[PDB]
Ligand binder design. Structure first.
Ligand SMILES: [Zn+2]
Ligand SMILES: [Zn+2]
Ligand SMILES: [Zn+2]
Lengths: 147, 119, 163
């Protein structure tokens, strides 16, 4: 550590979370695929509260749900916005991406695509995993702190 | 995700789309069968999995000598004839919780004192 | 300009959940828009403004709904401080305590294996000459001739060997 901030416990777990190769695959719980046809009200009633916000303020019906774990998402200091802003700039402006906040019983990232579109929704199922970095240097899996 | 096969030609039912009405339909791709969806959830892929499971009790477990006998009173029938073993999910992390098979009614009580299961 | 988006959000939300507060609407909403407008940065942020306030006023429809007036305030002063932190920690219920209960569970994960080995007072050390030495039977050639015996000093680090 840097000469001064070397005996600070929390300081140590801040650098940790900046070196460890943290992939979208690390925090994900389940990756689901839904048939949600009307992109103005979710079929899932545990999501209703989400759309209200991302509308208050032409795509495709094949929804892609992702549940992130709160636990893992705070070992490596991240927030829903940071996670979502990262996916939305990988495929950029051609995958309709949304995400919940940090105060809901369950975190969720819902994204839709924009002639066999259920087969292109898996080309991209694999990229959202083994080819996307959140925060960390590649090849650096596991980072342990020691006194 | 529970997946259904059709009648007659008995095969894998693949989900296709109903454009004009906006709904989901499973269909057979060697026959001509098609049916409605009981749910909108088509595909699930679990990564981080919550698991903690017992064994494949044939009730004949009592009829295996190589299983140890402790002496707790079974919750229901109160018979101190137990046989026990650890979780059969032989994964590296899973814990040392003992499962007791009551040899009187085949009830399955545990040793746990942090959580609870009806499993 | 796009304060309409700011406008409807407050007014609408704080009065439409339940019709129970009337005309106090034109003071709760009105007051806490310039605070965000004075910070919005008509551009600058680019959405780091939106991100906060938008996502603030969505912490308002969730499971904290008993406390999801207020609003009715305890010093509604929280919003200027809803631009730094941004309070954030301040928005949940006791699910706060859960979040910080998870915090600890994560530190324990970061630290690594602790080398614990029973030390013997029947050993002389060169480095610190102390009586704190652990070893491990083995191994080279066991018995005839004899058998190696490798110690260690967990104080000093040195290693020697017998035979
Ligand atoms: Zn068929
Ligand atoms: Zn019994
Ligand atoms: Zn020594």
């Amino acid at each position: 550590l840097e000469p001064g901030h070397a005996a600070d416990q929390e300081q140590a777990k801040l650098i940790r979370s900046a070196i460890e190769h943290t992939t979208l695959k690390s925090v994900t719980i389940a990756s689901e695929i839904y048939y949600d046809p009307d992109p103005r009200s979710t079929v899932i009633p545990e999501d209703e509260e989400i759309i209200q916000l991302h509308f208050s303020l032409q795509q495709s019906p094949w929804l892609l749900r992702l549940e992130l774990d709160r636990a893992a998402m705070n070992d490596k200091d991240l927030t829903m916005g940071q996670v979502g802003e990262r996916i939305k700039q990988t495929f950029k402006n051609d995958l309709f991406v949304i995400w919940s906040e940090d105060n809901d019983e369950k975190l969720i990232i819902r994204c839709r695509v924009v002639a066999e579109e259920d087969h292109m929704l898996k080309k991209i199922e694999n990229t959202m995993l083994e080819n996307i970095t959140l925060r960390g240097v590649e090849n650096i899996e596991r980072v342990v702190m020691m006194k | 995700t529970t997946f259904r096969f059709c009648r007659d030609c008995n095969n894998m039912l693949y989900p296709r789309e109903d454009k004009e009405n906006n709904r989901l339909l499973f269909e057979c791709r060697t026959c001509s069968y098609v049916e409605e969806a009981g749910s909108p959830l088509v595909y699930r892929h679990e990564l981080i999995t919550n698991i903690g499971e017992t064994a494949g009790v044939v009730q004949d477990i009592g009829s295996d000598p190589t299983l140890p006998r402790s002496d707790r009173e079974c919750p229901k029938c109160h018979s101190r004839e137990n046989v026990f073993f650890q979780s059969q999910q032989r994964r590296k992390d899973t814990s040392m919780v003992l499962f007791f098979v009551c040899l009187s009614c085949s009830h399955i009580f545990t040793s746990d004192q942090k959580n609870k299961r009806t499993q | 300009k796009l304060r309409d988006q700011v406008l409807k959000a407050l007014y609408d939300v704080l009065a439409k959940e339940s019709e129970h507060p009337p005309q106090s609407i034109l003071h709760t909403a009105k007051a806490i828009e310039s605070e965000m407008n004075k910070v919005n940065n008509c551009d600058t942020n680019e959405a780091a403004y939106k991100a906060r306030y938008r996502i603030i006023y969505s912490n308002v429809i969730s499971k904290n709904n008993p406390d999801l007036k207020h609003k009715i305030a305890n010093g509604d002063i929280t919003p200027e401080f809803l631009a730094t932190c941004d309070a954030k920690d301040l928005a949940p219920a006791p699910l706060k305590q859960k979040i910080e209960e998870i915090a600890k569970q994560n530190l324990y994960n970061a630290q690594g294996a602790t080398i614990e080995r029973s030390v013997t007072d029947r050993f002389t050390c060169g480095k610190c000459k102390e009586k704190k030495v652990s070893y491990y039977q083995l191994q080279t050639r066991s018995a005839d001739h004899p058998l190696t015996t490798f110690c260690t000093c967990e104080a000093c680090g040195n290693r020697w060997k017998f035979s």
